Structures are given as structure tokens and as C-alpha cells.
Write a protein that binds this ligand. Sequence first.
Ligand SMILES: *[C@@H]1O[C@H](CO[C@@H]2O[C@@H](C)[C@@H](O)[C@@H](O)[C@@H]2O)[C@@H](O[C@@H]2O[C@H](CO)[C@@H](O[C@@H]3O[C@H](CO)[C@@H](O)[C@H](O[C@H]4O[C@H](CO)[C@@H](O)[C@H](O)[C@@H]4O)[C@@H]3O)[C@H](O)[C@H]2NC(C)=O)[C@H](O[C@H]2O[C@@H](C)[C@@H](O)[C@@H](O)[C@@H]2O)[C@H]1NC(C)=O
Ligand SMILES: *[C@@H]1O[C@H](CO[C@@H]2O[C@@H](C)[C@@H](O)[C@@H](O)[C@@H]2O)[C@@H](O[C@@H]2O[C@H](CO)[C@@H](O[C@@H]3O[C@H](CO)[C@@H](O)[C@H](O)[C@@H]3O)[C@H](O)[C@H]2NC(C)=O)[C@H](O[C@H]2O[C@@H](C)[C@@H](O)[C@@H](O)[C@@H]2O)[C@H]1NC(C)=O
Ligand SMILES: *[C@@H]1O[C@H](CO[C@@H]2O[C@@H](C)[C@@H](O)[C@@H](O)[C@@H]2O)[C@@H](O[C@@H]2O[C@H](CO)[C@@H](O)[C@H](O)[C@H]2NC(C)=O)[C@H](O[C@H]2O[C@@H](C)[C@@H](O)[C@@H](O)[C@@H]2O)[C@H]1NC(C)=O
Ligand SMILES: *[C@@H]1O[C@H](CO[C@@H]2O[C@@H](C)[C@@H](O)[C@@H](O)[C@@H]2O)[C@@H](O[C@@H]2O[C@H](CO)[C@@H](O)[C@H](O)[C@H]2NC(C)=O)[C@H](O)[C@H]1NC(C)=O
Ligand code: NAG
Ligand code: NAG
Ligand code: NAG
Ligand code: NAG
Ligand code: NAG
Ligand code: NAG
Ligand code: NAG
Ligand code: NAG
Ligand code: NAG
Ligand code: CA
Ligand code: CA
Ligand code: CA
Ligand code: CA
Ligand code: CA
Ligand code: CA
Ligand code: CA
Lengths: 367, 367, 367, 367
Amino acid sequence: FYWRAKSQMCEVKGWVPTHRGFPWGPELPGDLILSRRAYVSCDLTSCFKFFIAYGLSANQHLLNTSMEWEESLYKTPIGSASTLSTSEMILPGRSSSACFDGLKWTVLVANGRDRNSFIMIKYGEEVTDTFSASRGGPLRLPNSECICIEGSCFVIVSDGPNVNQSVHRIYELQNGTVQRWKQLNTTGINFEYSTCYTINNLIKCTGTNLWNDAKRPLLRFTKELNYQIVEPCNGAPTDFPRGGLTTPSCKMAQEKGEGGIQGFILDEKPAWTSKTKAESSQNGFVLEQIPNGIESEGTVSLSYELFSNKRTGRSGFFQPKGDLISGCQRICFWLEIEDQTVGLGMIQELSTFCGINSPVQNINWDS
Amino acid sequence: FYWRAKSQMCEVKGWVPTHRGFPWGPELPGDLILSRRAYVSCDLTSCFKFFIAYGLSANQHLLNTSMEWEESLYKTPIGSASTLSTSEMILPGRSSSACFDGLKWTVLVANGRDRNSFIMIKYGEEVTDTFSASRGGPLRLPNSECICIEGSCFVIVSDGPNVNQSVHRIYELQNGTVQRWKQLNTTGINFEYSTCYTINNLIKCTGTNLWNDAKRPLLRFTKELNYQIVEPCNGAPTDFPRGGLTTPSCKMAQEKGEGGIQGFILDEKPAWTSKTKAESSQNGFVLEQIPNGIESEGTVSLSYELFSNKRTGRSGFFQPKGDLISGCQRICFWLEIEDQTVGLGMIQELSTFCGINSPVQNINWDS
Amino acid sequence: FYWRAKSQMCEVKGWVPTHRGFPWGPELPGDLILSRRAYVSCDLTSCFKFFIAYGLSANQHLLNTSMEWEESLYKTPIGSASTLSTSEMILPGRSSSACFDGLKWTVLVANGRDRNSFIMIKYGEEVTDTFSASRGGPLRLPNSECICIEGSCFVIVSDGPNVNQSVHRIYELQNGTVQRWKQLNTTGINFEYSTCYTINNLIKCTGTNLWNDAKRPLLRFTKELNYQIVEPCNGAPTDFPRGGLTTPSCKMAQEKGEGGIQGFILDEKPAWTSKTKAESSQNGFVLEQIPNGIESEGTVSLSYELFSNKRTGRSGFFQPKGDLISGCQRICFWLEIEDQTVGLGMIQELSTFCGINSPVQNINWDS
Amino acid sequence: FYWRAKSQMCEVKGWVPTHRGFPWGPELPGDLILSRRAYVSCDLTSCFKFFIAYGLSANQHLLNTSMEWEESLYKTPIGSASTLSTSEMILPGRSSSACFDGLKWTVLVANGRDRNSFIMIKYGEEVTDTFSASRGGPLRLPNSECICIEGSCFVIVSDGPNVNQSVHRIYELQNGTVQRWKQLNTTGINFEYSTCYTINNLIKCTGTNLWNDAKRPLLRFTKELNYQIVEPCNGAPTDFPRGGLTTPSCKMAQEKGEGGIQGFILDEKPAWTSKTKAESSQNGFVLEQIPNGIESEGTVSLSYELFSNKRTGRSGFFQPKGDLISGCQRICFWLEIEDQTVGLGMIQELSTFCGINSPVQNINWDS
Ligand SMILES: *[C@@H]1O[C@H](CO[C@@H]2O[C@@H](C)[C@@H](O)[C@@H](O)[C@@H]2O)[C@@H](O[C@@H]2O[C@H](CO)[C@@H](O[C@@H]3O[C@H](CO)[C@@H](O)[C@H](O[C@H]4O[C@H](CO)[C@@H](O)[C@H](O)[C@@H]4O)[C@@H]3O)[C@H](O)[C@H]2NC(C)=O)[C@H](O[C@H]2O[C@@H](C)[C@@H](O)[C@@H](O)[C@@H]2O)[C@H]1NC(C)=O
Ligand SMILES: *[C@@H]1O[C@H](CO[C@@H]2O[C@@H](C)[C@@H](O)[C@@H](O)[C@@H]2O)[C@@H](O[C@@H]2O[C@H](CO)[C@@H](O[C@@H]3O[C@H](CO)[C@@H](O)[C@H](O)[C@@H]3O)[C@H](O)[C@H]2NC(C)=O)[C@H](O[C@H]2O[C@@H](C)[C@@H](O)[C@@H](O)[C@@H]2O)[C@H]1NC(C)=O
Ligand SMILES: *[C@@H]1O[C@H](CO[C@@H]2O[C@@H](C)[C@@H](O)[C@@H](O)[C@@H]2O)[C@@H](O[C@@H]2O[C@H](CO)[C@@H](O)[C@H](O)[C@H]2NC(C)=O)[C@H](O[C@H]2O[C@@H](C)[C@@H](O)[C@@H](O)[C@@H]2O)[C@H]1NC(C)=O
Ligand SMILES: *[C@@H]1O[C@H](CO[C@@H]2O[C@@H](C)[C@@H](O)[C@@H](O)[C@@H]2O)[C@@H](O[C@@H]2O[C@H](CO)[C@@H](O)[C@H](O)[C@H]2NC(C)=O)[C@H](O)[C@H]1NC(C)=O
Ligand SMILES: *[C@@H]1O[C@H](CO)[C@@H](O)[C@H](O)[C@H]1NC(C)=O
Ligand SMILES: *[C@@H]1O[C@H](CO)[C@@H](O)[C@H](O)[C@H]1NC(C)=O
Ligand SMILES: *[C@@H]1O[C@H](CO)[C@@H](O)[C@H](O)[C@H]1NC(C)=O
Ligand SMILES: *[C@@H]1O[C@H](CO)[C@@H](O)[C@H](O)[C@H]1NC(C)=O
Ligand SMILES: *[C@@H]1O[C@H](CO)[C@@H](O)[C@H](O)[C@H]1NC(C)=O
Ligand SMILES: *[C@@H]1O[C@H](CO)[C@@H](O)[C@H](O)[C@H]1NC(C)=O
Ligand SMILES: *[C@@H]1O[C@H](CO)[C@@H](O)[C@H](O)[C@H]1NC(C)=O
Ligand SMILES: *[C@@H]1O[C@H](CO)[C@@H](O)[C@H](O)[C@H]1NC(C)=O
Ligand SMILES: *[C@@H]1O[C@H](CO)[C@@H](O)[C@H](O)[C@H]1NC(C)=O
Ligand SMILES: [Ca+2]
Ligand SMILES: [Ca+2]
Ligand SMILES: [Ca+2]
Ligand SMILES: [Ca+2]
Ligand SMILES: [Ca+2]
Ligand SMILES: [Ca+2]
Ligand SMILES: [Ca+2]
């Protein structure tokens, strides 16, 4: 009854778009709910976009409301645009995580500022738990799906006012109730915006180091909260911003390590990295396969420039949970595509891509 | 299969927002159904806003229709804005009550002026009972959820043309059919706008005395309709309008006792009172904990100022009906927040809060 | 598996509104589908408004389209306004009938002019049958629900170009396929706009004589298509137009017999008649109880004036099919309420009333 | 579980409209998704319009977006207008095919240009296969429903950069997974826009020759992918453009053979042809019955001018899948009708007609 990943991950030799973002810009229709910090998560039947709403479109501008500073989490079926008719308001929240365990949705949101920040957890209809900042706040949820295995759901929560002394904990939940937690030893790094997937009883997450690294730190942990934090050992940093290519080593890429943006590394053998085409602008998106894994020298084989010029933002994992034909576990990612509008600035729309077990041509989806 | 409350109510050390009203104001979208006399009630998976429609928005002003005087009850999933696409017209009615017994919805509405006033009851999609005013009318339902236990649903019905000569009955329904009713001895008082909850085969309601009390009368009764009406024994009335603090006693507070607004007191030990921040205006909302209970002298311990400057209105209880994890009974409340709009007056929107068994910081939800 | 009415009709002591029409007028929101020839019919769960669409509203005026002359049948859930989001286009058609037999919807529509007229029938998704005019056409369906008994559904179909030489057949269908039909002997009269119900596995229909009667002819028939056409033996015609009150006989009332409008008579004991408040215009609506039946002298006990001043139009029967509580078969009617608009003329909205076997007051629902 | 057509096709003596396209033009409502390359396909309860969206309506004009060049496949229930609330984005694609096998939808889309072109396949909610071009691309799906028999689904895929050297293959899928394919010998012809149906475990398709024929080539094949390609042997070409009548023979009609539009021939005995009324413009639509089959001399018996002056476009087969009642297999077709708008050019809307077993009169559906 509780979901768990299929026994092995599908071989990944390509990536195909299953959903392009709605093609808004320079104009968009009215009564659209404008979203940020969006991500994807699925029940056993279909997938949804979870997001924080910050405005509603009206004649190309923003309806004058308090939506921007009264922050609430919404969800919309992936195949629909986010409008008042198609989107459901779930809880108030500035950051969030959500995941379906096979029976019910567990949803976490963070509210309040600094020392007042607290997290609440909902399982189904029911608020089941809360906890407050303990290292100064704000508490921060990763804005990517949490990970459920056989009824236990895991999420990374971050605390602390400064990226140079952040605190990161794994929380284990059951029926929306904290069972235990483990504070990770992250001395010398920062680990925000965890995006994760699960395979053979392991949870693997990619972080974003906003302090002193342009490589993305990686976390591997078990259902028992045993863990290891790992550094990519190639010479191609994947955060944005970042410096240029370097000699492969397991060392941090400190050139332009400050700042960053949510992103992912498929931490398997082969591994896949993902990054902007250019180190100079947040444009394009490139997927590269590293057969010997992320802790090898990083020699690339397959390479796919999914976008060249389109402006791209945050990205992260989600996993289909109800496949019937596939005997192996599929892996997908979501990716913000940024569009310029005439009357309310830069918007982002999520597209989604899933791994396939066959190679395809190096199609450019810029269109 | 019929819902029943848990044997004892959860500890409440704090209140967190589960739904902040849709953030309309100064502008709001077109084709919104404007609501009044709203309250919240839930089935096993979702919560709904039940309300009387009084108009439709159109380009920031009111569409010219008969909606305000041809009154009908609607319901909207709490997480959706009320539009013609998301809201369902249930029955015509000037006042109402609704509750889910585990299988189907019981809905009661009152219609008619003075002596011709009558109440109609629906169970699922079927009209199942009616009854007429017995004391001159109009019949008034409380505009807060009715209370179901083991398939019996209970609601306070009021009658009589004046507040100084009002009559109030507990009606028990099963399958939308009146089983019995009991007329309360309310001589000397007035008991409008009952808002109730249940635990352990007890039902507790907070009333509003529109005649001669600025404290709120309380009612406790059993499934078998044995009851007592009791008066708060502190010195801080919680109706609006009201006078200032006085010496604690079990006596009514007649200073500014005339008039009032629907509100609630959590009648447990500890007890929780709720009220506007000051007697001078309908601004803010404050929750105060009284460890020794509402019939004690009223010494307060915990105190939360959930709102300071936002204008607030009606408030009442609701109980989520899908609680599968908690061993104890949770409690929540809904609350009108008033906002000014550019072109159709002051609107009301429901926010909801639920009690949690741990404290949180004294957050002000004004912004 | 197939629906049949409950063994006995509920006693009808009064009539209560279950749905007041949407209170549009003088203005209406945009994107409403404007409806005519509407009626109500139900599945085992809920009820739908079936109608021929003739336009779409846009800023108080009609969008400029072909909708008025390319006529199509739609349905909308009764609790929803008819919008592009809530309404479903079923089949093209200028008149129609629909009924749910417990498993699927049977829908009939007529198309074409005079000699070219044909009817098609849908059962579920599938078009199951069609037939052509036999008497010069146009074929005309009654714009009221057809009548299903244990998987056989019955509908009255009218043919013939002249009202003084009309032809009427009872058609019996199963699974949307015509099993048999029976031509009625209606020489001397005209029997359009049949509106029917069933009980004691009899079908009873009220007609509209557009030729030479201000009284309404009545039809009674069995599953074997044995039948009786009967005239009301009171002196109070219920059609419109109509002449003045007169002497109780079983004689037609030729006075202002030409023309007419769809209406109903509860052909039981007691019987109920229904008509505008008075003969001069189309205002109000009056329900009158005749204990001895419609073939008696026609003396009235109860007289409920449901509307006094509101302008009213077509009316007809519908039967709830999924009642779980009532052991007896309920009976309802739909009724056109006409409202004037600022920019697109007179519109019609359906109200629905249901009989109750409990008490009710003589409330007027005009204001 | 799996769908299969009956052993015999129902008798067609007539064609009646089951859906007249939404009657837009000269005006249309806002927030409508505009469609191209649309076709109809059904599951067990409902029929859907599948289409490639190219824009969104706003105040009579095209919203300024990237929708025309970022092409995605959408699906709308046939009885709803395509809006943001009623339409579902399925997959990115420039052409597509879809079909329901009794359990799930199989959906194919083609993306990329020339050598990068590839098709991807979804079965239910899961991507299940992909394949690439064999002759330089682009791969082209026929934009009409694929054909499922007993769980095996068949579709024609076309390849190659020039109509004078096109390649065409039958692909057989099961569970959205390619089982096998067969490249057809189409030397000397071109076979685009296949529109197909099934009867008695055969598949029949009508192609469009864009190279050198104004007659339409026909394909017939078995589940085992044994096939024959045939030429109509009458003297009346049905492609558009086309020349005039000729002496009947089995030879290609090369006058004005270049170019074409998707269309159908019912390849039975009797056979039915379909074409524009006018030879030199795309106006009207005429269905002609040829008793001795499409390989006969072509003598026409029944003839129906369904449209005279309406501008018409693509047309193709679909087969309703809920047909529980009939013992014979029904056949329908969809057809583009084009209308002029005030502010955004020609739009096309699909109408649908189904073959019925009874004759009807020669109705003109222009009005
Ligand atoms: C691939 O298909 C080619 C085309 O076939 C045709 O189109 C395809 C789409 C299908 O519809 C087929 O059913 C069609 O046949 C094949 O090439 C054609 O082959 C036919 C013979 O089968 C040739 O027919 C000939 O026509 C010329 C006049 O243009 C005459 O020499 C003669 O016409 C006959 O007409 C009457 C019969 O109806 C007789 O009374 C008369 O005496 C005479 O026999 C020929 O039959 C046709 O010209 C070819 N078309 C083209 C474009 O090349 C091709 O099959 C054959 O190719 C031939 C050249 C020949 O060598 C055969 O041995 C090949 O098998 C196939 N390829 C394969 C492997 O099957
Ligand atoms: C808390 O983690 C600290 C940092 O560890 C590194 O970063 C983490 C985010 C994670 O990725 C982890 O896996 C990774 O190692 C620990 O401090 C580090 O300890 C390692 C040894 O395990 C040191 O490695 C040494 O470096 C010298 C340099 O000359 C080499 O000779 C050789 O490589 C050697 O192994 C790291 O230098 C050190 N990093 C820092 C910033 O201090 C820390 O564990 C250890 O702390 C050090 C100072 C030492 O006293 C050990 O005995 C401690 O275990 C860890 N804290 C705990 C309690 O485990
Ligand atoms: C066909 O029906 C006519 C009229 O029937 C009357 O109105 C019907 C709508 C229905 O309500 C019937 O119940 C009514 O009787 C009928 O002709 C009528 O017959 C009655 C005698 O039974 C006369 O009183 C009445 O005046 C007469 N009306 C007219 C306009 O003719 C027919 O019944 C009889 O008609 C007479 C003229 C004879 O032809 C006789 O053989 C026949 O029974 C009826 N025709 C048939 C074939 O049954
Ligand atoms: C009917 O009720 C009156 C009022 O009782 C009080 O107010 C009620 C709303 C409820 O809160 C009761 O519990 C209160 O006691 C009763 O009259 C009072 O009786 C009490 C003693 O029992 C006395 O102290 C008060 O002064 C009385 N007040 C008045 C106005 O006389 C009365 O006893 C009840 N009648 C019956 C039939 O029991
Ligand atoms: C929104 O409206 C308010 C109220 O009039 C006004 O003060 C403010 O300038 C507006 N803000 C924006 C974002 O335009
Ligand atoms: C970490 O960064 C913050 C913000 O720039 C700074 O104020 C703080 O002092 C830093 N910590 C130290 C001690 O370097
Ligand atoms: C979670 O709740 C389910 C009831 O749905 C229960 O069976 C299970 O034991 C619970 N797990 C824990 C440890 O809370
Ligand atoms: C609404 O329209 C009515 C009828 O035309 C008119 O009497 C009135 O002025 C309007 N009401 C308002 C408040 O504008
Ligand atoms: C309501 O009615 C049903 C019969 O339809 C009966 O089985 C059930 O016990 C009743 N429920 C209650 C709460 O009385
Ligand atoms: C609708 O538009 C048509 C075509 O432009 C035009 O002939 C007509 O004037 C319009 N109809 C009305 C009543 O506005
Ligand atoms: C109607 O359909 C039902 C269900 O398939 C079937 O049992 C019955 O035989 C059908 N009746 C006729 C007369 O077609
Ligand atoms: C095929 O068509 C192309 C495009 O028109 C043309 O350039 C080429 O010459 C043609 N080839 C032959 C052999 O007909
Ligand atoms: C398609 O899936 C069904 C359900 O598992 C299965 O019965 C069938 O064998 C599958 N077909 C193939 C080609 O494996
Ligand atoms: Ca960084
Ligand atoms: Ca009982
Ligand atoms: Ca008061
Ligand atoms: Ca037939
Ligand atoms: Ca008449
Ligand atoms: Ca493959
Ligand atoms: Ca051609």
C-alpha cells in the first residue's frame, strides 16, 4: 500500500520533454496565478505543480492585491495552466516540500521571519506536527519533493541566518509526524535547496552551496539516517554562477562560489550533470553523462544541449510513482524556463523532462 | 462508518493558520461570488466554505443583479476562490447550517419573513424534512457547522421576533430527519449564532447575546439533550460591542450588552477566549488561555495577538472530519477578515486557524 | 440495475424550492450560455439542466456568433451557472428529451425543417437510432424528460405541419433503440409539449393544446401502450393564453384556445393544478390542490401562491431517482422565471420546486 | 478488456451531424485555445478533440505568445470549447496520433526537424517508447486516430524530406511499445495524412498524395501487416486541389496532382467518397455512394451535399468505442469547417458526422 521505488533505476541514455512550460510572453492571459519556488510531485496516477503564488495577472499587469507578501502554497495538475479554476490553495507558506506516500500527501510549509519561523506538517486533511527555528531561523524547506519509502518520508530542513554558518537536518516523518531527525555535519559548506530521489532504499540529494562553492555538494543517506556528503570530482562546476573548467579533483570550486541556484546531479553510474550552456549567462541547459560516476575524473560521453539560448532557472528531480509498463524506476526533472512579459516582468514556467533508455538526437528545444 | 469525535481534546498551546483568506484588496478578480454569513465544514477529505451569496464582481464593481435579495446558500472548496466555475448553489436560504456525518451532508436553510418562516433540510441530494416557526418567526439557523456524532446531527434553531423574547431549541437529526427537539430555558438571556464543537458525546456551543450581555453565554449538552447554560466568570467580556474590564464574577456584563457578533470560547480546561484587540474598534484578534477554565476567576497565561490592525468579524468553530492519525480531538476556527476594495465596498474573507499542541511565537498575521 | 419509481408517490402537502434560478438581470456575467427550451432530468446521484443554447453573453450584449441558428443541446449541473467551463454540448437539435434509465442517459433530438426533419437518439456515447418524419414534419420532441421504467423509456413525439392536424406517437425505447410506438387518436385536439412522470408503472403526461383549448389535455398510459386522453372537469383553464373562470364541465375551453405554453397537472388524488396568477398576463404562479382528482368538479382545498408578480413561462415535471431516505417516490417541477436584461433581451432561468409530505407555509418567493 | 470492432460494418444510408463545431465567428470568446491538425478519438464513455494549439484568443485578437512555434498536443472533450480550464496539455508535438485500446490511451507525437526528428509514445500517463527517423526526417504522424485491435495498435508513420521520395511504415504497438514495423512499397506515389478505420480484423486507410495524384491512394492491411495499396478506379478525383472528371480507370489522376489535403474514402461495398463541392475552391462537402466499390467503374447511387458554401478543410475517420449496443460496427468522420473572425483570421472548428442505417433528406448544414 505504501509506495516504494521499483527495484532498479531505468538505464538513462536520453532525456525527453514530457511537458513544455506554457508558452506565455510577451503577453499572458488574465487570471493566471503567477508562481515561484515551483516543483513537481506525483500521486500514483498523475503529477502536480506545487508552488508559492505571488500574483494574479490582469490585462498584462498584476492585479493590485496582497498576494505577493501573503505567501501561500498552491498546486495545479501538470497539464493545466495555473488559474483560479484549476489551482488549489493548500497552506500558507514561504517555502515548502510535498510528497505522496501511496496513501496520503505529506506537505510541509515554513512561515514567519527569523526567530519566529516555524514549520507545520499536514498529512491528508490533518495538521499533524509543528516545530520552530532553533538556530535563529528562518527555517527553510527545499522547494522540491520530499522522499517517501514504505510509509516513511524524508526531507531536508535548513536553519540559521547566514549561509556561512547554516544548519541542515534530515527529518524522518510517518503520517506527518516527526519520528526522529539527524543534524548533518556540514562544517565548511552550505547545503540549500536539496533536490532528491530514491532508489534501492537510498535517498540521494543534490544541494546548492550559496557560500563558497560552485560545485554542487551531494548527499547520500539511508532510511536509518546514515549518510555521507560528497563533492563532485570532475572539473566542470554546475552551479550558477560559476567559474571556468578546472583540473579534475575532489576539491571545491571556490571561484564565484558565492550565490547559486537550485539544481541536480543524477548520482549514479553513469552519472548525469546539468548546467547552463554558458558560465557567463543563465542561458541554455546541458545534460552530460559521466559513465564512471560523479566521483571519477568526470570524462563525458553523451552530451545533450537541451536548450541553447532560452533563459533557464531552478531545476530538480521528481519521480513518477504509478508506472505500469516500466519494470524499472524512471527519473525525471523539472526546469524553470524564464519568459519576458510586457507588463509584469520576468515569469518562470516549469517544463519537465524524463529519462529514456534509448539515445536520441541532440535536439534543441529553444524552438 | 459514522463520524464521532475522539474521547478527549488535544492539548492546545498555540494556533496556526491553515488558510489565510484569498488576498483580495484593493482589487479583486472578475466573476467572484461575494459571500456573507460564511462558515467552514469538512467531509472526510476536503473542507468547504458554506455561504450566502450577495453579489458578483465585475471590473472591480458589483454586477447589477438580484443576488443580494434573492438569497441562496453556496459551497466552495476552501482552497478555491468562489467563482461560477468553482461554487455550487445548494438551496435558497437566509441563514444556514451544514455538517458531514461520515456518509452524507446534512444541510439546513431558513426562508421566509416572520410567521411564514420555515426550515428545510437536505440529506445528500434529497430534501428530507421541513418545519415551521412556532413563536412568530423568523426561524434562524446559526451560520456555523452543525454537530454530528454516531449519525445524529445537532443544531441550535432560534425563533421569536425580538431579542428580548427569543426562543432557542436543540434539534437532533438523523438522515436529515428531525428525531426530537428540546426547548432551552433561556429566560433572561438571548442565544444567537451558536457555534459548537464536540468531544466524547458532549456538545459545547458558544452563543451571542444580542440583548443584554457583552459576555458570551455558553451551552453544554449530551447526545440525550440534557444541558446546562453557563456564564463566563471572568471580568473580560469577548462580545463586540462591549465595555471594559471589570471585577471577575459569574454575572452578566450588561454594559454595552445590546448587539453583538458571532464568536467562540473554547470551553475546556484550559479554556481559550477570543476577541478583538480593544473594545473601541473591530480590529485585531486575541486568543487568551485560562488554565482554570471559563468558570474560574479567569487568570490568563498564554496570550496570542493573531491580528493587530486588520478588521475582523464573525468567528466560529469547525472540526476537520478526516482526522485519522490523532488519538485526541483537534479543534479549529474560522474568522472573517475584512478588506477594503477600490469599487465594491468592504468584503469579508474567511481565514482558518487550528490549535496545535506546542507553542509558537507571537506572530502578527496582519501582513 | 434499471431504475423504476418507488412503489407509491409521496403525499404532496406543499411545494418547496430546491433551486431558485440564478438571479441574473438587469446585468449578467460574460461567457454565460443563454438557454431556451430547458428542462431538468436526473441520474441516480444528481440533477441536470438540459437546454438548447442560442447565444453567449459578452459585456451585457450577445457575442456575435452563429449560435442562435445553429441550434445545439447542452447540459449543466443544476447547481452551476451555464458557462463554457461547466456546460457540455451533447448533440445538435432544435427540440429534445432526455432521461436516465439507471445505467445510461438516453437523449433524443430533432433536426431539420418540415419534410427534412429527423430524430436521432443517443444511449451513452453511442448514437443508437434515428428515424424520419412520417407526416410531413417537423418532428417535435417535448422539451421535458422522457420516462424510464425498468429499462424501457417512453417519450411523446409529435409530427405534422399544422396544429389543427397534428399527429402524436408514444415511442418506447430500450438501450436507445426504438422497440415500438403507438399513434394516438387525438382527433379534435392538439397535444404538444408533453411533460410526464411515472408511478404505479403508469405514465401520466400533461399536454399543451395550441389549437383550440385553454384547458390542458391529459394523457395516461401503461407500459403496454394502452392509453386514455382526458379533459380536466373543473372550470379553471391553466394554459396561457386563457379566458376567464367558468362553469365546471368536462368540456374544452375554446375561449382563447389558440396558442399556449408548456405546463403540468399532477394527475392524482388529490390532484394539483398550476397556472399564472391571473389570465391577463404571464405573472405569478399558483398551485392548487383538488382532493377529488382532476376529473371531479374541481373544488380547491390548498391554494399556494408561489409567485405573485415575477413573470413566469414554461413548466414541467421531473422525478428524483436516487433518494435513499424516502420510501416513497417524490415529484418535482421546473419552472421558467423570466428576467429583463439591459443588453440582450428577456432571458429565462429555471427554478425547481419539489413536493413535500411535511409542513409548509404559504411563502411568496417573488422578492 | 481490449477493444475490438465488430465483424461487420453497419449499413450506411445516411450521414448525420453528431457535433456541429462551436458556432464561433465573426466573434469568439477570450481565453479560447485555437487548434490546428485536430482529429477526434474516443474512449469508452467520451470522445475528445486532439489538436496542436497555435494560439490563445483575447478580445477578438491573438494574444502575443510563443504558442504558434512552441507546438504542443492538447486534448479537450468534444462537447467542451477548448479553454485553459477544459483542455489538457499532453506532450510537445508538431504532429500526432492517439487511440484508446480499451484500457489506456496510446499517444504518439513527432518532434525535431530533419535528421533530429523522433517520435515518442505515451501509454496512459507514462512515456513508453521512442524512435528516430530512418530517411533523414522529418518523421510525420498522420493527425488522425491510430487503430487498436485486441490490444495491438497500428499507425502509419511517414519519413523523408521530399514528397517525391517519401517513405511510409506501418508501426504496431502494444502497451505503447513498438513490437514491429513494416515499410510499405510506395514507389511512384506519396501517402501522407493516413486516416484509418477497422472492421473484421482489417485496417483500411485513405492517404493523400501530395506529389502526383488527385485521386486518393488506399491502403488495406491485416493485423499481420500483410497489405495492399490500391487506386480508385472511378473517374472523379477527391483530393484538393484536383482537376475535373475523367474516363473511369484505375490510373492515377495527375492533373493538379501536386499538393493535397487530408481526406477519406469509405473502402467498402458500397463505398463512399467525399470531397469539396467546388473543384477550384475549398467550399462545401459532398458524400457519394458507389454500390460496387471503389475499384468499380464508380457509378454513383446516393449523393449528399452536406455543405454547399461553407469553407471546408481536412477530414478523417473516427470510430466511437463505447458501442455496447450495436452488433455492427459504426463509422463517423470529422471535418474542419473554417470561419472568418473579426480579429484573428481564419479559424477551423471540427464537426462530426456518423453513418446511420436509414436514409435522410439532402439537408444543407451551411445554416
Ligand atoms: C514496388 O511497387 C512498385 C509500384 O507498384 C504500384 O504502386 C504501388 C504503390 C502499389 O499500388 C502496387 O500495387 C502498384 O503495382 C512496383 O513497380 C511497378 O510494378 C508494376 C508491375 O507490378 C508495373 O506495372 C507495369 O506498368 C507498365 C506501364 O506503365 C507496363 O509495362 C505494365 O502494365 C501492365 O498493365 C496491365 C496490368 O494491369 C497489363 O495488361 C499490361 O500488359 C501490363 O502488364 C506493367 O505491369 C509498374 O510500371 C511499376 N511501377 C513503377 C513506378 O515502377 C514494384 O514492383 C515491380 O517493379 C516493376 C518494374 C517490375 O520489375 C516488377 O518485377 C517489380 O516487382 C514494387 N517492388 C516490388 C519488389 O514489388
Ligand atoms: C565534520 O565535517 C568536517 C568536514 O568534513 C568534510 O566536509 C563535510 C561537509 C563532509 O563532506 C565530510 O565527508 C568531509 O570530509 C570534518 O573535518 C574534516 O575531516 C577530514 C578527515 O575526515 C579532514 O581530512 C584531512 O585533511 C588533511 C589536510 O591536510 C589531509 O591530511 C587528509 O585529507 C585528512 O583526512 C578534513 O581536512 C576536515 N575538514 C575540515 C574543514 O576541517 C570533521 O571531522 C574531522 O575534523 C577534523 C578537524 C579532524 O579533527 C577529525 O578528527 C575530525 O573527525 C567533522 N566532524 C566530525 C565530528 O566528524
Ligand atoms: C378518435 O377520437 C375521437 C375524439 O375522441 C375524443 O377526444 C379524444 C382526444 C379522446 O379524449 C377521446 O376519449 C374523446 O372521446 C373520437 O370521436 C369522438 O367520439 C365520441 C363518442 O365516443 C364523440 O362524443 C365525440 O363527439 C367524437 N369527436 C369527434 C371530433 O369525432 C373517435 O371516436 C368515435 O368517433 C365517432 C365520430 C365515430 O367515428 C366512432 O366510430 C368513434 O368511435 C375516435 N375514433 C376512433 C377510430 O376510435
Ligand atoms: C429558567 O431559567 C431561569 C434563568 O436561569 C438562569 O439563566 C438561564 C439562561 C440558565 O443559565 C440557568 O442556568 C440560570 O440559572 C431560572 O431562573 C433562575 O433560577 C436561579 C436558581 O436556579 C436563580 O438563581 C435566578 O435568580 C433565577 N433567575 C430568574 C430570572 O428568576 C429558572 O429557574 C428556570 N426555570 C425552570 C423551569 O427551571
Ligand atoms: C495598490 O493600490 C493601493 C490602494 O490604492 C495603492 O496605494 C498602491 O499604490 C497600489 N500598489 C500598486 C502595486 O500599484
Ligand atoms: C557570515 O556572513 C554574514 C553576512 O555577510 C556576516 O555578517 C557574518 O559575520 C559572517 N560570519 C563570519 C564570522 O564570518
Ligand atoms: C500511520 O497511520 C496508519 C493509519 O492510516 C497506521 O496504520 C500506521 O500504523 C501509522 N503509523 C504510525 C507509526 O504512526
Ligand atoms: C440596477 O438596475 C436597475 C434596473 O435597471 C436600476 O433601477 C438601478 O439603478 C441599478 N442599481 C444600481 C445600484 O446601479
Ligand atoms: C438512515 O437511513 C438508512 C436507510 O436508508 C438506514 O440504514 C440508516 O441506519 C439511517 N441512518 C441513521 C443515522 O439513522
Ligand atoms: C455580426 O457580424 C456580422 C459580420 O461582421 C455583421 O454582418 C453583423 O452586423 C453583426 N451582427 C450584429 C447584430 O451585430
Ligand atoms: C439492453 O442492454 C442491456 C445491457 O447490455 C442488455 O442486457 C439487454 O439485452 C439490452 N436490451 C435490448 C433489447 O437490446
Ligand atoms: C524531387 O523533388 C524535389 C523538390 O521539388 C526536386 O528538386 C527534385 O528534382 C525531384 N527529384 C526527382 C528525381 O524528380
Ligand atoms: C501489456 O500490458 C498488459 C498488462 O500487464 C499485459 O497483459 C500484456 O502482456 C502487455 N503486452 C506486452 C506486449 O507485454
Ligand atoms: Ca554556489
Ligand atoms: Ca437514534
Ligand atoms: Ca451583546
Ligand atoms: Ca432503427
Ligand atoms: Ca391553448
Ligand atoms: Ca524502443
Ligand atoms: Ca494531390
